[PDB]
C-alpha cells in the first residue's frame, strides 16, 4: 500500500534542534497535500506545518519563524526542521497526506507518529549558595541521561516561589532552609517525597525530621546552618567573649579607623540570635542593646549583608556574623580569619535560628522523577555535595559519609557549637508571617520610629 514511516524523534534542550523526517512507500508527486500535526498528552490534534503540490508552505502562529516544511520528491520524504526548541512544542508528531484518486474523492493517510521531548531542568537556590557548584553536579547529569540543568537564583525567591509555582510553572526543584517548607507543604506547592530506605540510610535521622509535616516528607535534607562569630585575628587575636564588652573594644577600633562587629541588620535571621539570648523580658533586653549600638553609633543604620561582607574582607570590621556559605569569599580576599561561639548576652549564650537547607519537587512540576534522580544520585552523594561545598561551603551536610571531614574543620566545629546553643526552626505556615512581624519590628527600632516595648506588642498580635 502507501504507508508513512516518521522518524527523528528524541529529547533535546530548550533552544536545540530537531529534524523529524517522514518517508512515505509511494511517489509524493501523487499527493496533493503533506503536512505534520501534534499531540501533547491530553489535548486536541494542532497542526504546526504543511506543503502542497504547489510548493505553497503555511505554519501555525506558534511554530512560525522558528519550524521549517521542507520535501524531498526524489527520497520521497517530508521534513520538519524544528529549530529552536521550547517546553510548550513537546508532543508526539505525526506525519500527515492527503491523495485526490483519480475521481472526485479524496484519501487522508497518517503515520506511526514520533515522540518529541523538550525538557529542562530548572533549580531555583539563593545567591549567597553554590549555585557554581550546583551547576558542575548538573553538568554532570547532562552527560549521563541528556536533561540540561540551569541552575538560577532569583532575589525574593522565598517569597516569590509561592506566587510564580502556584500560578505559572516556576522552577522543578527548589532551595532554601526547611522553615519555609511548611507553608509551600500547607498550600499544596510541594510533592511529597518518597526516597527508598536505602537512600534514606545515607542521611542521619535527626536531618529528615526537620523536612517533614503532617507525618510526610516534603523536602530532602543537604546540610545544617548556623550562624558564628567570623572575626578578623589580625585586628583582634583574642576576640569578645560577651557582647556587652563590644562597645569598648569599638571605642578602642574606632580610634584606628576600623569598626568592631558589622552584620546584615535588615535580616532578622542575623539579629534573631542577641534577642533570643536570654528570651518577653528577653526579647526587650536583646532588642535595646543592639538599639543602643546604632545609637552609640558603633553600628550603621542600614547595615546588609553586601556592606557587611565588604567592610569584613576589605579588613574594615574586626568582626561580622554570617553562615557556611560566606567563608569562601573571605578566603578569596587576604584575611586570616576565625569563626567563633557567637557572643554571650546577659551571660547566656545569644541563640542563632538552625536551619536545614532542603531540596523540595514543585507539585506543579512534569520532571518530578527526573528531579528525583538528581537529588538522590547526582547531588545527595559525597561527590555531589563535595562539588557545591568547594564552590561555597554548606554546613554540617546531612551526608553521614561526610562526619570525618566535617570533624576535620575547624570551622564547622564553631558552626555546630552555636547550632547546640541555638534551635531549629518549627517548618510551621505561621513561619512567613513571624519572620514578617520580626523584619519590620527590628528595622523600625533601628532606624528610629517605633520603641523597643512597641515593637514586640506589634509584633506579638
Ligand atoms: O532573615 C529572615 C530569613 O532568615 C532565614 O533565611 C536565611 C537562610 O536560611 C540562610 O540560608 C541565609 O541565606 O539567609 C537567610 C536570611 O538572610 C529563614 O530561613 C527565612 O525564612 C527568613 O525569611
Known amino acids: 500500500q502507501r504507508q508513512l514511516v516518521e522518524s527523528g524523534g528524541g529529547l533535546v534542550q530548550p533552544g536545540g534542534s530537531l529534524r523529524l523526517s517522514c518517508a512515505a512507500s509511494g511517489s509524493i508527486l501523487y499527493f496533493n497535500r503533506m503536512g505534520w500535526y501534534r499531540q501533547a498528552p491530553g489535548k486536541q490534534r494542532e497542526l504546526v506545518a504543511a506543503?502542497?503540490?504547489?510548493?505553497?508552505?503555511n505554519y501555525a502562529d506558534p511554530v512560525k519563524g522558528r519550524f521549517t516544511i521542507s520535501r524531498d520528491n526524489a527520497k520521497n520524504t517530508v521534513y520538519l526542521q524544528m529549530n529552536s526548541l521550547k517546553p510548550e512544542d513537546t508532543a508526539v508528531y505525526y506525519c500527515n497526506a492527503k491523495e485526490k484518486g483519480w475521481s472526485f474523492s479524496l484519501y487522508d493517510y497518517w503515520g506511526q507518529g514520533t515522540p518529541v521531548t523538550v525538557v529542562k531542568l530548572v533549580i531555583w537556590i539563593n545567591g549567597d549558595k553554590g549555585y557554581n557548584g550546583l551547576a558542575e553536579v548538573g553538568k554532570k547529569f547532562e552527560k549521563d541521561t541528556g536533561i540540561k540543568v540551569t541552575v538560577e537564583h532569583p532575589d525574593k525567591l522565598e517569597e516569590k516561589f509561592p506566587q510564580v509555582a502556584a500560578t505559572g510553572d516556576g522552577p522543578d526543584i527548589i532551595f532554601w532552609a526547611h522553615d519555609r517548607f511548611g507553608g509551600y507543604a500547607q498550600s499544596g506547592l510541594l510533592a511529597e517525597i518518597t526516597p527508598d530506605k536505602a537512600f534514606q540510610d545515607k542521611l542521619y535521622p535527626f536531618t529528615w525530621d526537620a523536612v517533614r509535616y503532617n507525618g510526610k516528607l516534603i523536602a530532602y535534607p543537604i546540610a545544617v546552618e548556623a550562624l558564628s562569630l567570623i572575626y578578623n585575628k589580625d585586628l583582634l587575636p583574642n576576640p569578645p567573649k560577651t557582647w556587652e564588652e563590644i562597645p569598648a573594644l569599638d571605642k578602642e577600633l574606632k580610634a584606628k579607623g576600623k569598626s568592631a562587629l558589622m552584620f546584615n541588620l535588615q535580616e532578622p535571621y542575623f539579629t534573631w540570635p542577641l534577642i533570643a539570648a536570654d528570651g518577653n523580658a528577653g526579647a526587650k533586653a536583646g532588642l535595646t542593646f543592639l538599639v543602643d549600638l546604632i545609637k552609640n553609633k558603633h553600628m550603621n543604620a542600614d547595615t546588609d549583608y553586601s556592606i557587611a561582607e565588604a567592610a569584613f574582607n576589605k579588613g574594615e570590621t574586626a568582626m561580622t556574623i554570617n553562615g557556611p556559605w560566606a567563608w569562601s569569599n573571605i578566603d578569596t580576599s587576604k584575611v586570616n580569619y576565625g569563626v567563633t561561639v557567637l557572643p554571650t548576652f546577659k551571660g547566656q549564650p545569644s541563640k542563632p535560628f538552625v536551619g536545614v537547607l532542603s531540596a523540595g519537587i514543585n507539585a506543579a512540576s512534569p520532571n518530578k522523577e527526573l528531579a528525583k534522580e538528581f537529588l538522590e544520585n547526582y547531588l545527595l552523594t559525597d561527590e555531589g555535595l563535595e562539588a557545591v561545598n568547594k564552590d561555597k561551603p554548606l554546613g554540617a551536610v546531612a551526608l553521614k559519609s561526610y562526619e570525618e571531614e566535617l570533624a576535620k574543620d575547624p570551622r564547622i566545629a564553631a558552626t555546630m557549637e552555636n547550632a547546640q546553643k541555638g534551635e531549629i526552626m518549627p517548618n510551621i505556615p505561621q513561619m512567613s508571617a513571624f519572620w514578617y512581624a520580626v523584619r519590620t519590628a527590628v528595622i523600625n527600632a533601628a532606624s528610629g520610629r517605633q520603641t523597643v516595648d512597641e515593637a514586640l506588642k506589634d509584633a506579638q498580635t
Open positions: 506543503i502542497t503540490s504547489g510548493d505553497s508552505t
